[PDB]
Design a binder for this molecule. Sequence first.
Ligand SMILES: [Zn+2]
Ligand SMILES: [Zn+2]
Lengths: 54, 136
Amino acid sequence: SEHELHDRVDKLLAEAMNIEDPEERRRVLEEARKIAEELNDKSLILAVKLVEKK
Amino acid sequence: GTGPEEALKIALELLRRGNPEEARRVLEEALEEALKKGDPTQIVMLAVLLADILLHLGNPEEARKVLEEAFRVLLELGNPEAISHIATDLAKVLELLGDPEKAREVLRRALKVIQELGNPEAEESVRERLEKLEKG
Ligand SMILES: [Zn+2]
Ligand SMILES: [Zn+2]
């Protein structure tokens, strides 16, 4: 289940990388952050933060 | 032209629409260029998506090759956050391949470079991965 959840985050982060509407982009990144912090997995949280910064 | 971001978007759609092999080839081509000319975030997300698609296609050794190639490049690009993600996904694929010893080596090498770069969040991230290795 954890690997499936990691995959879900990675796909949301890949999606956010090309989203043009800034508010749509925030929402998708928030979906990713939500999963990562619910898992309390520091590496997945940091994966979201890397893309948030870009 | 189809930059890394455009290739990610196309691949996500093709994967979801039942075309994983075509998603794979779209990312393989983009990653080839990003490894020479792309920034660390572009490299990371192309590589972790491509590798996971290969994993679930049943090609885990190809997934490892993709992550290992990206890992070697990202170790020199000065971004500890990018190193954390690529090493985490590489170590997990090595575990799934039945090679936990190389998973440890990957994480220990990532931690050493991250410590040299100076980023406590990236270092706590890789340390936690080293702890959570007791899985299969
Ligand atoms: Zn997966
Ligand atoms: Zn990942």
